[PDB]
Amino acid sequence: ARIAGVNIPDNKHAVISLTYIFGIGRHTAKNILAAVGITETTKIRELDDAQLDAIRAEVAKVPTEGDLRREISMNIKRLMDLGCYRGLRHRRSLPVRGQRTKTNARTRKGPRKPI
Amino acid sequence: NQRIRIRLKSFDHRLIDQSAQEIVETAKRTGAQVCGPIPMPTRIERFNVLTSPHVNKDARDQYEIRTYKRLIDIVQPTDKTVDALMKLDLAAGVDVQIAL
Amino acid sequence: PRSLKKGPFVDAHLFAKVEAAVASNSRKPIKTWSRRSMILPDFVGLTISVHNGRNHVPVIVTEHMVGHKLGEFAPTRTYRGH
Amino acid sequence: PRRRVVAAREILPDPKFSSQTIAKFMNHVMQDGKKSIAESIVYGALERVQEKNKVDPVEFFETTLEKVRPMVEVVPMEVRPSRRTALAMRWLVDAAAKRSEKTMALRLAGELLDAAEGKGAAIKKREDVHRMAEAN
Amino acid sequence: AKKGMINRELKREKTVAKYAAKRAELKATIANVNASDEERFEAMLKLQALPRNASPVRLRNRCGLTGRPHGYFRKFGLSRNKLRDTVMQGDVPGVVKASW
Amino acid sequence: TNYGTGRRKTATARVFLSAGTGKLVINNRTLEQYFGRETARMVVRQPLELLEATEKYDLYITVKGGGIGGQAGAIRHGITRALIAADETLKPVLRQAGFVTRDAREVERKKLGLRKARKRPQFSKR
RNA sequence: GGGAACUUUAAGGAUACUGCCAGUGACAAACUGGAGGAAGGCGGGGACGACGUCAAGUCAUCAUGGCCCUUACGGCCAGGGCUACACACGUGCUACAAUGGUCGGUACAAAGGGUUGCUACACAGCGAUGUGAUGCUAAUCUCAAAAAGCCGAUCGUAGUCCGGAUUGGAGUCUGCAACUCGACUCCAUGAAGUCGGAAUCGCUAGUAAUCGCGGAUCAGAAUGCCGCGGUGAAUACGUUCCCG
Numbered sequence: 001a002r003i004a005g006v007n008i009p010d011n012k013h014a015v016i017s018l019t020y021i022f023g024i025g026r027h028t029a030k031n032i033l034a035a036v037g038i039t040e041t042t043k044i045r046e047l048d049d050a051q052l053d054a055i056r057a058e059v060a061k062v063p064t065e066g067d068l069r070r071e072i073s074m075n076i077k078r079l080m081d082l083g084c085y086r087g088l089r090h091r092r093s094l095p096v097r098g099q100r101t102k103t104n105a106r107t108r109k110g111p112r113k114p115i
Numbered sequence: 116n117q118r119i120r121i122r123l124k125s126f127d128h129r130l131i132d133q134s135a136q137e138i139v140e141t142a143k144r145t146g147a148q149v150c151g152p153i154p155m156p157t158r159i160e161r162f163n164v165l166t167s168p169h170v171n172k173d174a175r176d177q178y179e180i181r182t183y184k185r186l187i188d189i190v191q192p193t194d195k196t197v198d199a200l201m202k203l204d205l206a207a208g209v210d211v212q213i214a215l
Numbered sequence: 216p217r218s219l220k221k222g223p224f225v226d227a228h229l230f231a232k233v234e235a236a237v238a239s240n241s242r243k244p245i246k247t248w249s250r251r252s253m254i255l256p257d258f259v260g261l262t263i264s265v266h267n268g269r270n271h272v273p274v275i276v277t278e279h280m281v282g283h284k285l286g287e288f289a290p291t292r293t294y295r296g297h
Numbered sequence: 298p299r300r301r302v303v304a305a306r307e308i309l310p311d312p313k314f315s316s317q318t319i320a321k322f323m324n325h326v327m328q329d330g331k332k333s334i335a336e337s338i339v340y341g342a343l344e345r346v347q348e349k350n351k352v353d354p355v356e357f358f359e360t361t362l363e364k365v366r367p368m369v370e371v372v373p374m375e376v377r378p379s380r381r382t383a384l385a386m387r388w389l390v391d392a393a394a395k396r397s398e399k400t401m402a403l404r405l406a407g408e409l410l411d412a413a414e415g416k417g418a419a420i421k422k423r424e425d426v427h428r429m430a431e432a433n
Numbered sequence: 434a435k436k437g438m439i440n441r442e443l444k445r446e447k448t449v450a451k452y453a454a455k456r457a458e459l460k461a462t463i464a465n466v467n468a469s470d471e472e473r474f475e476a477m478l479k480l481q482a483l484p485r486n487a488s489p490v491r492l493r494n495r496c497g498l499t500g501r502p503h504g505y506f507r508k509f510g511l512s513r514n515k516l517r518d519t520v521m522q523g524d525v526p527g528v529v530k531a532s533w
Numbered sequence: 534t535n536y537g538t539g540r541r542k543t544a545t546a547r548v549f550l551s552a553g554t555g556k557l558v559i560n561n562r563t564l565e566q567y568f569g570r571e572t573a574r575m576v577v578r579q580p581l582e583l584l585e586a587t588e589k590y591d592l593y594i595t596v597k598g599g600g601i602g603g604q605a606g607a608i609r610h611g612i613t614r615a616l617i618a619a620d621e622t623l624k625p626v627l628r629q630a631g632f633v634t635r636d637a638r639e640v641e642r643k644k645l646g647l648r649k650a651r652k653r654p655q656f657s658k659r
Numbered sequence: 660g661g662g663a664a665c666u667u668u669a670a671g672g673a674u675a676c677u678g679c680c681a682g683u684g685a686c687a688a689a690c691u692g693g694a695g696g697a698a699g700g701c702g703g704g705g706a707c708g709a710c711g712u713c714a715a716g717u718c719a720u721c722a723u724g725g726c727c728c729u730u731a732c733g734g735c736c737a738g739g740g741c742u743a744c745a746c747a748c749g750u751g752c753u754a755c756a757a758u759g760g761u762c763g764g765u766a767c768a769a770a771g772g773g774u775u776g777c778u779a780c781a782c783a784g785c786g787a788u789g790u791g792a793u794g795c796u797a798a799u800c801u802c803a804a805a806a807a808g809c810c811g812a813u814c815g816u817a818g819u820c821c822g823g824a825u826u827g828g829a830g831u832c833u834g835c836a837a838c839u840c841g842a843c844u845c846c847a848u849g850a851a852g853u854c855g856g857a858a859u860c861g862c863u864a865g866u867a868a869u870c871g872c873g874g875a876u877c878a879g880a881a882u883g884c885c886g887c888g889g890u891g892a893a894u895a896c897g898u899u900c901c902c903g
């Protein structure tokens with residue numbers, strides 16, 4: 001069932017299925033379903049039109065996919081523009097939170113590039 | 116209804132047991148009931164010390180120090196008993212704490 | 216970060232210098248070694264030369280710099296590639 | 298050793314059927330010292346086979362192990378009587394794990410039933426060992 | 434250790450003692466809830482205005498015979514070299530080699 | 534009427550054995566409530582099953598220290614000693630069954646320079 | 660209220676010595692199989708390291724011959740660095756899932772630490788934690804929830820309800836001060852990874868494996884080091900080849 005523009009899985013429980021939308025975790029799904037009054041284990045292929053619409057309305061109040069990506073990109077570019085140390089690390093693609101780089105920085109650096 | 120409670124601490128169990136024996140013998144001599152001496156569980160602290168000056172992590176010495184304790188109660192004491200305890204000598208290496 | 220109940224941290228000797236500079240119309244930079252002081256809204260528009268270990272680097276404070284420490288704008292190491 | 302002969306580690310019989318072979322199969326199943334889970338697997342599988350067919354679990358397991366006992370292992374090497382039962386136990390454990398029944402106890406009982414019937418992965422492996430063995 | 438570093442340590446120990454009382458007073462005022470906001474803020478500034486050496490965080494434990502800043506062992510107040518030497522001659526009471 | 538002490542791996546069980554009808558209490562719980570593991574229950578009943586006196590006695594037990602297996606072993610040892618105390622003629626069969634001997638295995642200490650009692654850190658020639 | 664029985668606490672002592680039975684070995688040395696006993700052939704573990712070797716390690720713990728500096732190679736201070744990063748190697752931790760993950764309920768330890776300390780209980784917060792207050796100088800009060808385990812529900816082999824790296828927001832505490840460069844909490848994000856080439860390491864029983872707990876250093880800052888207990892295996896025919 002399309003929610004927030006996404007085809008969330010239809011054979012899984014609601015609490016799991018809602019997590020396929022960007023920006024919605026276990027906590028957020030449990031709160032959305034608690035608000036609209038649906039059991040977490042209810043399967044998505046068992047929800048009527050009104051039930052789906054209520055979840056859509058609640059999920060609207062939380063920033064999910066495009067707004068969230070836009071906000072993240074803007075925050076990163078603002079740091080890369082101000083000229084702070086964090087922006088300088090973002091520019092060179094290096095750890096931002098004080099981790100060592102003599103070894104073990106592969107998530108940020110990529111596969112090891114030969115000399 | 117006053118029961119005297121003496122607590123003995125030391126690093127040496129032979130010395131502590133000698134002092135406890137002296138105390139109980141004096142109490143019985145002047146005439147009084149005594150409970151104990153009652154042994155208390157010992158404290159053990161352990162230390163690891165590098166033996167080489169510069170570098171050998173496995174070359175080490177392991178030391179320990181133990182504190183032993185004893186509890187003695189003098190029940191229904193006589194007037195002379197209290198003065199006898201004060202008259203008793205002081206032994207190096209044994210701490211005595213008497214509560215009335 | 217620093218707890219909110221304590222508030223922000225600013226060195227007294229730098230705070231007095233900024234007080235004087237803002238109260239008057241001085242254009243001369245403010246020369247400082249205090250890289251741990253926070254940038255307050257009163258800093259905006261001023262110029263502070265911040266120590267980096269060997270040199271004082273000019274910094275022109277904009278609104279977007281408020282809430283950062285002075286030293287976040289003076290890198291202390293030199294790297295150019297292997 | 299090079300100077301002595303070590304006595305075989307003697308294990309007690311199991312507490313529910315009193316069988317040394319059952320105890321040894323349980324120890325072969327157990328991982329990381331978790332005996333309780335191994336017991337729940339082995340006893341559960343024996344109960345499953347008993348429910349499917351009314352025979353004594355101990356003698357049924359004896360017969361299945363006799364069927365899955367390899368004669369030799371490839372060059373072929375003559376082996377002492379103790380090793381063939383161990384090899385049968387290991388093959389039985391592996392085949393059940395590779396099968397696909399929901400719980401390990403059930404897929405173990407399934408392996409045992411197939412081995413008894415004479416068509417299964419473990420018995421096929423035994424035949425393969427025999428075929429690469431008797432040639433040399 | 435160098436005699437200069439030892440003297441540094443002594444000077445810091447003197448400064449901490451000299452400013453110990455006012456530090457406690459200031460921190461108690463900062464902790465007070467009945468005291469008003471401007472009083473608490475003045476306390477915070479007066480705390481931040483004391484000389485750095487008054488802060489006990491800038492003390493470092495040293496051997497006491499040599500001044501070594503590594504391997505301190507609070508209970509004895511000595512570093513490992515001198516502790517080994519002094520323990521193995523019988524001048525540390527109640528300490529023996531440990532086995533179990 | 535008869536008392537026994539059993540010990541196994543830091544576990545110590547006090548057993549009081551009397552004539553009765555098969556009642557059995559451990560720390561004010563029944564066997565099922567005390568032990569959720571079935572073989573732990575089997576171990577505790579081995580002696581009276583070997584003796585066939587399962588309903589010919591009553592058992593009041595307390596246990597301290599150790600874990601499930603050690604406590605079950607200590608309780609079995611205590612029951613065996615209680616039976617021996619009650620009827621000395623029964624000690625031979627209990628010795629044959631192996632319930633008379635005390636297991637003396639205990640955790641071996643960690644040693645300086647090693648990861649554990651025996652395990653050694655990885656060696657490399659270079 | 661009582662009791663001194665049992666558990667434990669901790670000083671002293673007894674006990675195992677081929678002690679007895681059978682076969683056999685030069686009638687040497689001994690070696691096999693049994694009964695009593697908690698334990699039967701060094702009971703397990705720890706400390707203890709002959710004579711010597713490598714002109715092996717340490718002048719940066721310290722002492723010390725000789726040589727050098729002594730307006731500086733001596734002393735004081737503030738900021739920075741020792742944490743850098745095209746790469747290569749050693750030692751470890753966490754996973755790659757169903758003998759598992761999550762959720763609800765409910766059991767069983769030992770050894771250590773505690774007054775510039777550890778904190779019952781109450782309130783506030785989702786939480787790190789904050790405020791009030793109580794006992795304890797500890798076999799008395801406290802850190803303290805053991806975890807794996809047992810019972811039930813769900814997940815159905817999926818890069819997933821596996822994995823938790825990286826990154827954006829918002830906070831707490833220690834501290835004069837967490838930018839370079841602390842730990843921890845919540846919301847969001849959800850990378851490699853499907854059991855690992857040549858080759859190579861540990862371990863012979865309460866061991867390996869696996870599960871949690873404590874301490875020294877120390878304002879704060881352990882996946883290391885030194886300890887503690889819970890659950891608890893497999894295999895050894897043999898010295899030809901590899902190493903000392």
Ligand SMILES: [Mg+2]
Nearest residue numbers: 713714715716
């Ligand atoms: Mg040399």
